[PDB]
Design a protein around this ligand. Structure first.
Ligand code: CLA
Ligand code: CLA
Ligand code: CLA
Ligand code: CLA
Ligand code: CLA
Ligand code: CLA
Ligand code: CLA
Ligand code: CLA
Ligand SMILES: CCCCCCCCCCCCCCCC(=O)OC[C@H](COP(=O)(O)OC[C@@H](O)CO)OC(=O)CCCCCCCCCCCCCCC
Ligand SMILES: CC1=C(/C=C/C(C)=C/C=C/C(C)=C/C=C/C=C(C)/C=C/C=C(C)/C=C/C2=C(C)CCCC2(C)C)C(C)(C)CCC1
Ligand code: SF4
Ligand code: SF4
Lengths: 739, 80, 37, 139, 69, 131, 128
């Protein structure tokens, strides 16, 4: 059933003059200067002012369309700049030497050295986003195709923005339509996810597979036929993998083995291009198609059959759980914040899997050996992936203060988690400290025995070994599966577990990443910093309503700065300060993951292979006996590999060296806000608003200090911007030079 | 324990009394008019110094003031 | 409609636009204004 | 008068409540009468159930027996609650409402302890009570 | 085994396995206390009938770990 | 109540180890129940020192290694007695009068701990260097 | 016979909402969707497996066998009419299948629906 209100709010520019018209206290006017910061925080905080569960949902359904628009604007910005201001057509002629370049700089006051000698006949900034290998995978040959996508995106950008107008200002849906989660999962698995990969199978077979099989032979970008010509001409396509002469007729008599030529299970790297065989990804997305379509006929709708989720959670209850999942379906239909937290966790955690599965199984042609790009899609999606988990911890806490109800949730699983929340945290507290001693303290042991000249006493490979036997048995059994347990696979799932090396050009696409004592030592640091980031974020969710210290933390709101200096001091008791605290730990958690990844590849995995057959890597296998101490981590990774970012002056990398200093600046600026407090900086306004009153021009909006949380929030927002953009500039001006 | 003083600028609004999380304060009859009321702190041994009280006095400069003093088990809010 | 143009952030960027727009054309016009000639 | 034992609400849980301090010094308790079978968030975790009662629950501190009442009276409209602080290991029974009426309301007979008959800038200076045991903020 | 023997360090694997057995095989025995009792009537918090099984279970688990490593 | 009712809280087969250890036990005198603790913690403490030490491959590794094991215990019976001076100011009488609530046998616990804390320690040095 | 697939809501939806148990349909039209269903796949076996398959002519003759069973099945649907409904004797329920009440057009609703299926399904495999 689809029930609608027709035009609840019309098209007026009249409310645009009143900022804070959505709210109550801010639709009256500012009296201090914090009212700007009081405004600009709680704009898109939709249940802060709105009480109507139906109307608060209609805003969210509209605003997603606008967020769907701004990606499409941004996508067209990639697709438009890919045609005019790129060396893309030249790059398809030669994928090995010429670097992917877009964002050409205007010829002005000195930034015209950033349009360096990149290749082709071109001058621009060498980019590392991999759109060139995403358009070479998509089958794009001419530069006209990149143009028509951009307008083709821009019309979808405009169509999405009109649809957000159409569904709130014109046709607002109701809450009984919103709460139909079972029909929503049926379509989102069926339409979006089932027909997602099926349509991409519908692209990749008829479009990508011919023109990318030809470019492996590499006849010419111009001499490859246009993508519509492989549907018109029946003879032209069936020259290669000749099953199209049989048509859809093996597909319609269930004799599917006649498509063993384009819909296959090759399973390796395409040795000319270093990427995944696009035949497999056609069979992948076809198997993903049928798996998701039959996943979408599962939930109950208005045709009687199906699983209904209020029936499944009930009678999933055991003796160690009491009521089990009674009422947990009633949470996720009644609270957007509980939905956003779970939607965020498996969205960021998903993207870290994308970062892991893209460097070890490179999906794209000439993305693997282009070390400028194969690094930068790991470390970007890892970085996105940690920020969403911190957002998953935030809205989980916001559910606890404002949306969680102990009336409905008696003796079920949110009740029994909250009723043992010390046993969770204190055992989590122990395993945090246990992990810090037995991972980081194994470096301080390793620091000292090298400083004291006792390398028989450190933890190394030629020393007291800490062998990762579980990660070597898993790396063994996955590398000996093509033929035993995966027979129809030709080679393994990846060459990262085991097998021979592969080269494209003169550079290595993939080789088995080995795990010794130095890899055991770093993998527990990851396990340590993830458990602390859990511990900060988990404690924020669990103690969000009350604790032993404050019994009404639920009354003081999600985001309140302190309860004052009482009880010895209660500075940062709120759940928001836990999300504020976990942000640096997620900064600490991920930046060592990147430091593990970007150093392990350069010394052990990436590098230049001889035409004799052996590989000389970039930083030269130093990760074995150098990475076990901090001084080796400082010298041989941080000090040594930053030699190209501070020597970037006078070259086309010179914008990176400014940012490597420019992010060192902002990171220092953030320390001013975290280390200080409000009641100092307020009283410096009092002497200064004295002076602006002194010369008879004082602002009627009287200035005040920033709020303590805004002092906290600007201290972390400049910390991350100062810290990640340092790593952003370091990782760029390292791997553009040596790769 | 903390010291809680109540100054003579109290306007008997009762906001402070209803802000204390441990019930340290109460309103008492005032004799300057025999119609208004002033706040009192008969149980300062339970004051934790949270300062929620002072955040409730409307007057431009507090009628109730919390001066942190000797700390104790009760004032530190220990359940242990 | 023009009352929306009068508000704080739209005028804190469009006057930030032409004023930065003045410095940028005069440098493209007249490069390296280091000393008063 | 406490009436211990009054029947506690049917709970079964909470690692977070009434630990070893209660068996060496000064635990607490709160008494009220439940006018339904409604559920409420405890200061420990959340649920108990309000009985007919005679509803007593040995909480941890004073702050939790005060913040329960400011949660009871708003949600469940019950202003009959009668907190305590215990016998032998504790100090004073019936800590609230100390007058029988709620001490946010005004009542004849109370004492004005801790009143300063001045303004706060009208306090003496700490330069003026050097090596003098008179408190600066005290009358 | 840097300070001991090669066939001496098996005895730590075998004797841990008797403690690994009876720590989680011990609380699984439903009918306990059936005779006989200890030889010198030592009032000890298990029976020799039960404890012989743990040493038997420990001898099987220890054979699995020793041959497993 | 105060505690929580899981299906495994206060289970029998873990309580049989709990109420029969020589610190929660029934009839042992505080000279003697500190011996069974000191015999316990001492025998394994010469584990880590003799196979993980500064010198491990010498005459010489079990001997010197096991000096530090009894060299650790003497810092422990020190830490036991500073706990005795600071928790038992005159052994102030408390709710149970265990060995642990009210003291009454603490320097019999302390002296009992040091007997096996040197006795069991060298016994392994007998069992490691010889046998 | 009461557990579990005689009693489930997944079958009681599908059982009732077929045109032999559906309430709203008429005997010309509920013999039609019954006729449209069984007739449509009946061309399936013959065009793949017949007396001759590797011919022109394998789909023509396969569909020509397909209407052959149907015209016997009009007779079998009418000889269940001419035997079970002799004198149009009622019973204690009197649906379409208990007593007749719609049977003279139900034998042709199969004929319209069954041979209308093979006339439909011939132009999918042989043609288009
Ligand atoms: C995704 C967001 C995005 C970003 C960050 C940029 C950024 C840029 N664009 Mg691009 N552009 C985009 C989307 C984007 N564009 C889209 C979707 C289109 C299709 C309409 C274009 C069409 C376009 C053209 C034709 C040109 C640029 C140019 C530029 C550069 C100069 C700024 C400018 O000309 O704006 C104009 C300033 C304003 C609108 C502010 C008033 C700058 C790198 C110029 C360039 O690349 O020079 C080398 C240029 O000539 N853009
Ligand atoms: C089968 C057709 C179909 C398709 C293609 C989609 C696709 C989408 N829906 Mg979904 N949706 C569907 C059926 C479908 N829906 C139905 C039948 C319902 C009601 C039960 C919904 C209820 C729904 C909501 C509430 C939301 C979406 C949203 C979305 C977008 C998610 C953004 C993205 O990942 O890309 C995506 C465009 C999100 C969105 O962008 O809304 C504007 C969103 O918030 N959908
Ligand atoms: C089922 C998971 C899945 C996987 C592993 C892939 C893999 C791939 N996709 Mg495909 N795709 C999928 C489903 C998937 N697809 C779906 C559902 C859609 C519709 C939204 C698409 C639409 C699509 C387009 C338009 C394109 C690709 C492309 C590709 C290739 C590029 C690398 C990449 O995307 O990162 C790998 C991604 C992941 C590892 C995360 C998977 C995310 C899904 C939602 C997980 C679903 C959960 C699943 C049931 C359980 C797995 C959990 C976890 C292990 C992932 C790679 C072979 C590109 C290509 O053609 O390259 C040549 C390309 O242009 N995909
Ligand atoms: C989901 C999107 C999609 C779309 C729109 C198409 C569309 C088409 N396919 Mg393709 N095809 C697809 C997915 C898709 N296919 C997939 C997932 C497979 C693998 C099973 C194929 C395997 C396939 C074969 C073998 C053939 C077609 C053919 C065709 C064309 C004629 C079919 C017809 O209309 O009757 C038509 C343009 C026919 C064609 O013209 O091939 C060149 C044909 O012979 N398709
Ligand atoms: C590099 C600086 C630094 C260090 C060493 C620490 C250390 C710690 N943080 Mg902290 N943290 C830091 C910066 C640091 N943090 C910053 C900048 C922030 C602001 C965002 C925080 C915010 C933060 C939060 C929010 C939390 C922590 C927690 C922790 C503890 C984690 C558990 C652990 O590993 O215990 C083991 C200890 C170590 C690994 C420290 C090094 C010890 C060495 C290796 C051994 C000692 C050698 C020797 C014996 C020393 C004595 C010698 C002498 C007596 C002779 C640990 C003590 C968490 C916690 O408390 O969990 C229980 C926690 O939740 N920190
Ligand atoms: C708003 C600030 C600002 C100001 C005061 C100017 C001023 C000027 N522009 Mg510039 N310009 C600006 C922003 C500005 N521009 C922006 C945002 C763009 C990108 C759309 C341009 C793109 C542009 C071009 C292509 C040209 C000018 C030119 C000029 C000069 C002559 C005006 C004319 O129309 O002929 C004048 C100095 C002309 C000139 O003299 O360039 C040499 C000229 O050809 N402007
Ligand atoms: C705060 C210290 C400071 C000072 C004293 C200067 C001074 C100068 N800079 Mg430098 N610079 C600075 C910070 C500073 N800059 C910063 C923060 C950056 C990074 C953005 C730069 C990056 C930079 C570049 C890339 C360039 C300069 C240039 C110049 C010269 C300006 C020539 C000109 O156009 O004037 C002419 C003045 C007018 C036409 C009138 C000004 C009208 C404005 C709009 C009035 C503003 C009122 C509102 C002048 C020597 C140019 C140069 O030639 O270097 C020597 C030049 O190309 N600067
Ligand atoms: C500044 C004072 C100081 C001195 C002189 C030493 C000396 C020593 N330390 Mg160091 N240590 C110190 C402070 C000191 N430590 C501090 C402050 C820390 C914390 C950061 C450490 C952390 C540290 C560690 C982790 C280790 C040492 C070890 C050692 C020993 C190496 C050689 C050896 O074992 O011979 C071989 C000889 C023996 C093992 C036996 C020697 C005699 C033992 C110590 C005592 C025998 C019992 C004795 C009769 C009574 C107890 C002595 C006690 C009361 C003083 C050497 C005895 C290593 C060691 O072997 O520990 C024992 C070792 O692993 N130290
Ligand atoms: C881990 C195995 C485990 O999950 O046991 C399963 C047990 C719950 O099992 P039940 O079958 O009682 O619970 C059924 C519900 O969990 C869902 O139906 O979980 C607990 O006891 C808490 C787990 C945390 C225990 C900390 C260790
Ligand atoms: C594996 C396992 C386990 C176990 C472990 C443990 C618990 C161990 C311990 C053990 C131990 C810990 C042992 C002990 C032993 C001891 C000994 C056996 C010693 C001896 C001693 C002696 C001999 C002494 C005496 C003396 C003295 C006192 C003086 C005089 C002289 C002499 C020398 C005689 C468990 C169950 C947990 C669980 C499962 C797994
Ligand atoms: S102390 Fe403050 S809140 Fe209390 S009555 Fe006086 S002015 Fe009102
Ligand atoms: S400081 Fe806090 S506890 Fe003390 S009286 Fe004021 S509000 Fe109440």
């Amino acid at each position: 059933k689809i029930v609608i209100d027709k035009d609840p709010v019309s098209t007026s520019f009249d409310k645009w003059a009143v900022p804070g018209h959505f709210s109550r206290t801010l639709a009256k006017g500012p009296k201090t200067t914090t009212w700007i910061w009081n405004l600009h925080a709680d704009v898109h905080d939709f249940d802060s002012y709105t009480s109507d569960l139906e109307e608060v949902s209609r805003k969210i359904f509209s605003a997603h369309f606008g967020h769907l628009a701004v990606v499409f604007i941004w996508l067209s910005g990639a697709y438009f700049h890919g045609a005019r201001f790129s060396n893309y057509e030249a790059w398809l002629s030669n994928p090995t030497t010429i670097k992917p370049s877009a964002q050409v700089v205007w010829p002005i006051v000195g930034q015209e050295i950033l349009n360096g000698d990149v290749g082709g006949g071109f001058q621009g900034i060498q980019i590392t986003s991999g759109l060139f290998q995403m358009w070479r995978a998509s089958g794009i040959t001419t530069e006209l195709q990149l143009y028509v996508t951009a307008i083709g995106a821009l019309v979808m950008a405009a169509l999405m923005l009109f649809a957000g107008w159409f569904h709130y200002h014109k046709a607002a849906p109701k809450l009984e339509w919103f709460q139909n989660a079972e029909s929503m999962m049926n379509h989102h698995l069926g339409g979006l996810f089932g027909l997602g990969s099926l349509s991409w199978a519908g692209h990749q077979i008829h479009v990508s597979l011919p023109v990318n099989k030809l470019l492996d032979s590499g006849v010419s970008p111009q001499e490859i036929p246009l993508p519509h010509e492989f549907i018109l001409n029946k003879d032209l396509i069936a020259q290669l993998y000749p099953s199209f002469g049989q048509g859809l007729t093996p597909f319609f008599t269930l004799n599917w083995n006649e498509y063993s030529d384009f819909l296959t299970f090759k399973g390796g790297l395409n040795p000319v291009t270093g990427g995944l065989w696009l035949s497999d990804s056609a069979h992948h997305h076809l198997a993903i198609a049928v798996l998701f379509i039959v996943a979408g006929h599962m939930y109950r709708t208005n045709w009687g059959i199906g699983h209904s989720m209020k029936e499944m959670y009930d009678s999933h209850k055991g003796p160690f759980t009491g009521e089990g999942h009674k009422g947990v379906y009633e949470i996720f239909t009644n609270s957007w914040h509980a939905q956003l937290s779970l939607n965020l966790a498996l969205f960021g955690s998903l993207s870290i899997i994308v970062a892991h599965h893209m460097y070890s199984m490179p999906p794209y042609p000439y993305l693997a050996t282009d070390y400028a790009t194969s690094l930068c899609l790991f470390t970007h999606h890892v970085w996105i992936g940690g920020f969403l988990i911190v957002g998953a911890g935030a809205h989980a806490a916001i559910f606890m203060v404002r949306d969680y109800d102990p009336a409905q949730n008696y003796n079920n699983l949110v009740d029994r988690v909250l009723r043992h929340r010390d046993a969770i945290i204190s055992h989590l507290n122990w395993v945090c400290i246990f992990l810090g001693f037995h991972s980081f303290g194994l470096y301080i042991h390793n620091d000292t025995m090298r400083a004291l000249g006792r390398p028989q006493d450190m933890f190394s490979d030629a020393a007291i070994q800490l062998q990762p036997v579980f990660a070597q048995w898993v790396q063994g059994v996955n590398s000996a599966a093509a033929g035993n347990t995966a027979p129809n696979a030709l080679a393994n799932a990846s060459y990262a577990f085991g097998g021979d090396i592969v080269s494209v050009g003169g550079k290595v696409a993939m080789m088995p990443i080995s795990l010794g004592t130095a890899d055991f030592l770093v993998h527990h640091i990851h396990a340590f910093t993830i458990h602390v980031t859990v511990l900060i974020l988990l404690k924020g969710v669990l103690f969000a309503r009350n604790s032993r210290l404050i019994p009404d933390k639920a009354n003081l709101g999600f985001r309140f700065p302190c309860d004052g200096p009482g009880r010895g001091g209660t500075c940062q008791v709120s759940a928001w300060d836990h999300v504020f605290l976990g942000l640096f730990w997620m900064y600490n958690s991920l930046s060592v993951v990147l430091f593990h990844f970007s150093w392990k590849m350069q010394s052990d995995v990436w590098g230049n292979v001889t035409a004799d057959g052996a590989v000389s890597h970039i930083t030269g296998n130093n990760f074995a006996q150098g990475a076990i101490t901090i001084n080796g981590w400082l010298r041989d990774f941080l000090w040594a590999q930053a030699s190209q970012v501070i020597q970037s002056y006078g070259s086309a990398l010179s914008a990176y060296g400014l940012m490597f200093l420019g992010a060192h600046f902002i990171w220092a600026f953030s320390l001013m806000f975290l280390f200080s407090g409000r009641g100092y900086w307020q009283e410096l306004i009092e002497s200064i608003v004295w002076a602006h009153n002194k010369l008879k021009f004082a602002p009627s909006i009287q200035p005040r200090a920033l709020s303590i949380t805004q002092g906290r929030a600007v201290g972390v927002a400049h910390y991350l911007l100062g810290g990640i953009a340092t790593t952003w500039s370091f990782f760029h001006a390292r791997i553009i030079s040596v790769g | 324990a903390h010291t809680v003083k109540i100054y003579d600028t109290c306007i008997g609004c009762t906001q402070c009394v209803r802000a204390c999380p441990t019930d340290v304060l109460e309103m008492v009859p005032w004799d300057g008019c025999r119609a208004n009321q002033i706040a009192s702190a008969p149980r300062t041994e339970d004051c934790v110094g949270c300062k929620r009280c002072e955040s409730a006095c409307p007057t431009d400069f507090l009628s109730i003031r919390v001066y942190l003093g000797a700390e104790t088990t009760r004032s530190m809010g220990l359940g242990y | 409609f023009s009352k929306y143009l009068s508000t704080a952030p739209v005028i804190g960027t469009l006057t930030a636009f032409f004023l930065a727009g003045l410095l940028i054309e005069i440098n493209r016009f007249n490069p390296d204004l280091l000393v008063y000639p | 008068t406490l009436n211990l034992n009054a029947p506690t609400p049917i709970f079964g849980g909470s690692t977070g409540g009434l630990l070893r301090k209660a068996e060496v010094e000064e635990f607490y308790s709160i008494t009220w009468t439940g006018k339904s079978e409604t559920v409420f968030e405890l200061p420990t975790g959340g649920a108990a159930i309000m009985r007919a009662g005679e509803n007593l629950l040995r909480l941890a501190r004073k702050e939790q027996c005060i913040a329960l009442g400011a949660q009871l009276k708003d949600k469940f409209k019950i202003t009959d609650y009668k907190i305590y602080r215990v016998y032998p290991s504790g100090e004073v029974q019936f800590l609230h409402p100390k007058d029988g009426v709620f001490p946010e309301k005004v009542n004849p007979g109370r004492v004005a302890v801790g009143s300063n008959k001045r303004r706060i800038g009208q306090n003496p200076d700490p330069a003026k009570l050097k090596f003098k045991g008179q408190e600066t903020f005290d009358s | 085994t840097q300070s001991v023997g090669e066939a001496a360090e098996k005895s730590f694997v075998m004797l841990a396995s008797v403690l690994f057995a009876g720590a989680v095989g011990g609380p699984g025995i439903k009918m306990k206390g059936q005779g006989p009792a200890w030889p010198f009537n030592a009032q000890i918090p298990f029976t020799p009938s039960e404890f012989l099984a743990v040493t038997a279970l420990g001898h099987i688990i220890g054979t699995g770990v020793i041959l497993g490593i | 109540i105060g505690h929580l009712s899981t299906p495994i809280s206060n289970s029998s087969a873990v309580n049989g180890l709990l109420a029969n250890l020589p610190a929660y036990r029934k009839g042992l005198t505080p000279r003697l129940r500190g011996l069974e603790i000191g015999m316990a913690h001492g025998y394994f403490l010469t584990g880590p020192f003799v196979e993980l030490g500064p010198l491990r491959n010498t005459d010489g590794g079990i001997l010197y290694g096991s000096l530090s094991a009894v060299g650790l215990v003497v810092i422990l019976t020190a830490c036991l007695a500073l706990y005795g001076k600071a928790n038992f100011s005159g052994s102030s009488k408390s709710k149970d009068a265990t060995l642990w609530e009210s003291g009454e046998g603490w320097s019999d616990f302390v002296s009992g701990w040091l007997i096996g804390g040197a006795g069991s320690v060298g016994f392994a040095y007998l069992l490691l260097q010889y046998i």
